[PDB]
């Protein structure tokens, strides 16, 4: 299908500017326009831009207007927005996406279609505090059985966790984010395997934080 | 098919008597058989085991329809056939057929108390009509052009 | 109406006006939008619906 | 290839390569034939539609 | 044979009817054979009916091939006297959505 990749993800320290740029390929740009959605950690789904297949209309969100734009280039297929002046409620996941519109934002050739093409990006995460990004620190816990990892200590929230370098998908509990009175973020990651697996079989947890470098590996087992 | 089109062949029917023929199937005021088949009987109290092999080298399919025939009863058989039961093989490279006759009383019908069971073979271009008998056969005399035609059947009284 | 207006590419249904002021030529969005809507839902149910059949 | 599906069940010597196979469609091709010891099958259009199914 | 199984079985065998008398006779040193294949649900008499036939790859003789369904717990029973062309063994046969096609596409 189509394929895109999407750049310009971080934190951005208060009253400053963002830069995402989502350039996909497989179809044909020059005909679709797009739109750009946010949505903000926890729940809620706000629009923020649209973007013809020309640049002849670019419509805004009362939300972000007057502070943001959208831009597109069709010789490097590339879609891409600006906002400045960003606060704790503009902190959010951010969609490149074909969503359903009125029809002249779309070409003349794709009026009408059977398929009404479609499709929605990964979020591209942008976070706004004070930048201090740090590493994580993981602790393993341990005593029908039940073990897990826990992480904590670290700003930038695309934590991924995997399993004796990825094998185990069963019973995977991973938890949501937790915020405090801090500024640091915890998740911990567990699995429950009957009380049978001791001596059978040992493990391995795993914490990839990307924003901040850090790949590390600690075993699971009791004291 | 659409067509009667028939053409006689010359099998070699050696040591037997063909045409025969019987008192129900009347032709012009003498006794008669089926025009297209030929009643194969003893010679001399001995029916020799028939092997006859009929080519196919034109350039389309060949009908041969033939039978067997099943008599009344027993001494009817030897006295046809100067023996006790026939087996007949119809057979070609891509088919073949094994008929039995069995013995036994019928209604008569037109006072004859036997039966004639009928049979059909096609042969391709190519093929070999192979017949192996020995009694109770009822040979046929040629072949049938066969053709992809668009003709059918219906069955009416009207004029 | 007599003919058709070639000259209108971004949509089907328009007004033509000529007023002192010059004349000009706007299409209708509305009515193009419900008349395409109705054709894309006849094409979805048209196209790409097909059922199998095995044996 | 070579062999009709019926070769294949009765295991024509060069219809091998299909022993223990499975198969959603069969693709029989005209030119397939059979070189082995000849035989002929009663109902055979209803075996090879059953060993199809 | 028995079937103890979950699934049905498809047996397949068959009956070889020799061109001559004496080609029957060296094979099975009698007149003429009687092939009764059977089960508590079915069963099936084939006869060899001796015969030439046209030849096909010199072989003036023929093969006639007959199959056999045996359900769960049923019990296939082969009786023979000669001319059998037993089987070796028994095909699975599923409720499948397979089929084949006649083309000479590539
Ligand atoms: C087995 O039994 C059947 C009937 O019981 C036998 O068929 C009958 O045979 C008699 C004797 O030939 C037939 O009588 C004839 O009727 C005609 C009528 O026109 C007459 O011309 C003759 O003089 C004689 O009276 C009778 O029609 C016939 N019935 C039927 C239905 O075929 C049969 O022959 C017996 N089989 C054996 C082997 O004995
Ligand atoms: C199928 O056709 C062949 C071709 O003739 C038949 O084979 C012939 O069968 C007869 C008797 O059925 C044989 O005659 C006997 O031969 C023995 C051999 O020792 C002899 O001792 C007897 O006195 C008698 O003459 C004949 O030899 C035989 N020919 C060949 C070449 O095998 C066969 O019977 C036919 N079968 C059917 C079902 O029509
Ligand atoms: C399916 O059947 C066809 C036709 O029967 C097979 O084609 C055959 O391919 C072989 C190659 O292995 C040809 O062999 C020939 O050998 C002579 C020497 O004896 C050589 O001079 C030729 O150049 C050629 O190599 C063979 O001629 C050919 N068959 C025919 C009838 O022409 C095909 O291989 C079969 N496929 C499978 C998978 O069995
Ligand atoms: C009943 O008659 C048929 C045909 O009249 C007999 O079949 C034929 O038998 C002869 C003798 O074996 C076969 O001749 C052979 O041809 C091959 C060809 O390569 C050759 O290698 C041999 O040296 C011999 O000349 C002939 O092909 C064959 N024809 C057919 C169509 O099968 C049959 O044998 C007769 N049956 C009896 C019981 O006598
Ligand atoms: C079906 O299968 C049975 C099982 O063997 C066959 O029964 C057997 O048949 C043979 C000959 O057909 C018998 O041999 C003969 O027995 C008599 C008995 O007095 C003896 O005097 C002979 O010298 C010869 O040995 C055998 O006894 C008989 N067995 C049983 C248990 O009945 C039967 O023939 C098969 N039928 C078919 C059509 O396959
Ligand atoms: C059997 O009857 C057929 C016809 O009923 C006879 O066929 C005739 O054969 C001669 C050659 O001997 C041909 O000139 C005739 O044209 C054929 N007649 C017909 C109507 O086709 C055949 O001769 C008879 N054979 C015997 C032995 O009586």
């Known amino acids: 299908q189509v394929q895109l990749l999407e750049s310009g993800g971080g934190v951005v320290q208060p009253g400053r500017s963002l830069r995402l740029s989502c350039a996909a390929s497989?179809?044909?740009?020059?005909?679709?326009?797009m739109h750009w959605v946010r949505q903000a950690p926890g729940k809620g789904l706000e629009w923020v831009a649209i973007?013809?297949?020309?640049?002849?209309?670019?419509y805004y969100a009362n939300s972000v207007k007057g502070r943001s734009t959208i831009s597109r280039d069709n010789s490097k297929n590339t879609l891409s927005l600006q906002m400045n002046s960003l606060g704790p409620e503009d902190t959010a996941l951010y969609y490149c996406?074909?969503?359903?519109?009125?029809?002249?934002?779309?070409?003349?050739?794709?009026?009408?279609?059977?398929?009404?093409?479609?499709?929605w990006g990964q979020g591209i995460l942008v976070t706004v505090s004070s930048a201090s990004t740090k590493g994580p620190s993981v602790f393993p816990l341990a005593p029908t059985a039940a073990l897990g990892c826990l992480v904590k200590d670290y700003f930038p929230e695309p934590v991924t966790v995997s399993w004796n370098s990825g094998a185990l998908t069963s019973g995977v509990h991973t938890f949501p984010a937790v915020l405090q009175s801090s500024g640091l973020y915890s998740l911990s990651s567990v699995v429950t395997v009957p009380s049978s697996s001791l001596g059978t079989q040992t493990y391995i947890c795993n914490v990839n934080h990307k924003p901040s470098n850090t790949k590390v590996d600690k075993r699971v087992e009791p004291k | 098919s659409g067509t009667l089109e028939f053409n006689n062949e010359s099998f070699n029917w050696t040591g037997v008597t063909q045409n025969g023929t019987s008192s129900a199937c009347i032709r012009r005021s003498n006794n008669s058989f089926f025009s297209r088949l030929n009643w194969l009987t003893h010679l001399n109290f001995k029916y020799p085991a028939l092997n006859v092999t009929m080519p196919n080298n034109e350039q389309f399919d060949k009908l041969y329809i033939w039978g067997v025939h099943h008599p009344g009863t027993d001494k009817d058989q030897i006295f046809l056939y100067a023996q006790s039961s026939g087996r007949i093989t119809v057979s070609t490279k891509r088919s073949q057929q094994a008929v039995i006759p069995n013995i036994g009383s019928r209604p008569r019908i037109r006072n004859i108390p036997s039966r004639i069971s009928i049979y059909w073979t096609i042969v391709k271009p190519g093929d070999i009509l192979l017949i192996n008998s020995t009694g109770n056969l009822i040979a046929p005399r040629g072949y049938f052009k066969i053709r992809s035609g668009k003709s059918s059947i219906m069955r009416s009284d009207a004029p | 109406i007599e003919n058709g207006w070639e000259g209108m590419v971004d949509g089907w249904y328009g007004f033509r006006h000529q007023n002192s002021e010059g004349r000009g030529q706007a299409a209708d969005l509305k009515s193009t939008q419900a008349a395409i809507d109705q054709i894309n839902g006849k094409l979805n149910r048209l196209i790409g619906k097909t059922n199998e059949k095995f044996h | 290839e070579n062999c009709t599906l019926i070769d294949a069940l009765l295991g024509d010597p060069q219809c091998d390569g299909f022993q223990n196979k499975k198969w959603d469609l069969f693709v029989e091709r005209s030119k397939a034939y059979s070189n082995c010891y000849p035989y002929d099958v009663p109902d055979y259009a209803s075996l090879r539609s059953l060993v199809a199914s | 044979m028995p079937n103890n199984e979950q699934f049905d079985k498809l047996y397949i065998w068959g009956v070889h009817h020799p061109g001559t008398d004496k080609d029957q006779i060296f094979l099975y040193a009698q007149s003429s054979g009687r092939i009764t294949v059977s089960t508590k649900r079915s069963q099936q008499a084939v006869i060899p009916n001796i015969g030439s036939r046209p030849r096909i790859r010199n072989i003036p003789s023929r093969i006639s091939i007959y199959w056999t369904i045996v359900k769960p717990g049923d019990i296939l029973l082969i009786n023979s006297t000669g001319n059998l062309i037993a089987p070796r063994g028994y095909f699975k046969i599923r409720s499948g959505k397979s089929s084949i096609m006649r083309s000479d596409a590539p």
């Open positions: 973007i013809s297949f020309d640049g002849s209309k670019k």
């Open positions: 996406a074909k969503l359903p519109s009125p029809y002249y934002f779309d070409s003349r050739f794709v009026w009408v279609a059977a398929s009404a093409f479609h499709f």
């Open positions: 497989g179809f044909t740009f020059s005909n679709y326009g």
